[PDB]
């Protein structure tokens, strides 16, 4: 998240690309926007513990209770996975990923 | 640098040693809802005295 982008092409970096225990850093060219939220209205209460120290915790939830989630566009994410597949099939030729 | 910055920022804050006690937790969310991950835990905290 929030990184620097590649210049013109998706760049696939790994130590070997044949050892299966090596993490592949895929570097995109176009960023994909994610929107993350926790929608339930939460509160805060302070519980005094010892001299001069407090402890902040959840006191109550006001309103209805909904689901914390994140939203990505499906078309853009499909296009990004397809372009990563384009750049990745030339390192694993004549194969389906 | 990230590890040491995290530790030296987290050093002078409140330590939660007196809170590790026996918790009585019944229920917080009314029904299953979306995810009933809340839990209403009560305990015997220590005051200034």
């Amino acid at each position: 998240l929030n990184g620097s982008l590649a210049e013109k092409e998706i760049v696939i970096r790994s130590e070997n690309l044949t050892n299966n225990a090596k993490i592949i850093i895929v570097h995109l060219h176009t960023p994909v926007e994610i929107v993350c939220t926790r929608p339930n209205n939460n509160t805060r209460k302070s519980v005094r513990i010892g001299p001069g120290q407090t402890f902040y915790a959840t006191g109550d939830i006001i309103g209805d209770i909904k689901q914390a989630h994140c939203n990505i566009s499906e078309e853009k994410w499909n296009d990004t996975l397809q372009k990563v597949g384009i750049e990745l099939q030339k390192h694993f030729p004549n194969k389906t990923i | 640098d990230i590890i040491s910055l995290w530790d030296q920022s987290l050093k002078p804050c409140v330590k939660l040693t007196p809170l590790c006690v026996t918790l009585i937790c019944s229920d917080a969310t009314v029904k299953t809802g979306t995810v009933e991950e809340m839990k209403n835990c009560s305990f015997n905290t220590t005051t200034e005295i």
Partner: antibody
Amino acid sequence: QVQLVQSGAEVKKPGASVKVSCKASGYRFTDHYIHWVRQAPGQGPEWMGWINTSSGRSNFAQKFQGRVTMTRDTSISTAYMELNRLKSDDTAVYYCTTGSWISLYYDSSGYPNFDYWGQGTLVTVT
Amino acid sequence: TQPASVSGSPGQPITISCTGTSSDVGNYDLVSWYQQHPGNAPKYMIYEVTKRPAGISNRFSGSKSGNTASLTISGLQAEDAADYYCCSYAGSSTVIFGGGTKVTVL
């Protein structure tokens, strides 16, 4: 066309409890919020509470706490309003209204989109 | 807050206002208008700050300025003498009303 059926008149002495039923027809009971509106005669209406019909979570007004409970049954698709310790000022018309769309991702409970109103009931405290 | 009553001749627009606080109308644009004939359930023709549901013509139009919301009725007819109430979201998932405006169509 959807329609909400409400109960008949309730005549009783002060100090007792009143249950008001609201039965929905024509649409799914689980899909929409149910709000309650109390209107005294010669007086404008007043919102009194909402219920989530999917999980039974309900909230009331700032001064109806401790006197009001709200239940529902999704099998026969109805909601119940229980009011305890009535007084002579509780003589009013009670309305079951259909609110916003129940969604799993955002809080649309407080939206005052009262689409369909029931026929209401009259509660007279003598 | 709401004016007690308004009066007007047929064929001309009128305005009914509702002045709330910053938390009621200023923070959230959730305002609505409901007319009510006597001896009947309240109607429903405004739900958002300006929108209208199906089956309602362009007689009524909502607007919001600052901390108040005004409903403009473009022309007056004999059935337009009902009691009008404004309504809004207010604070901690609660809903408040206006109180009432009686329209006197001449």
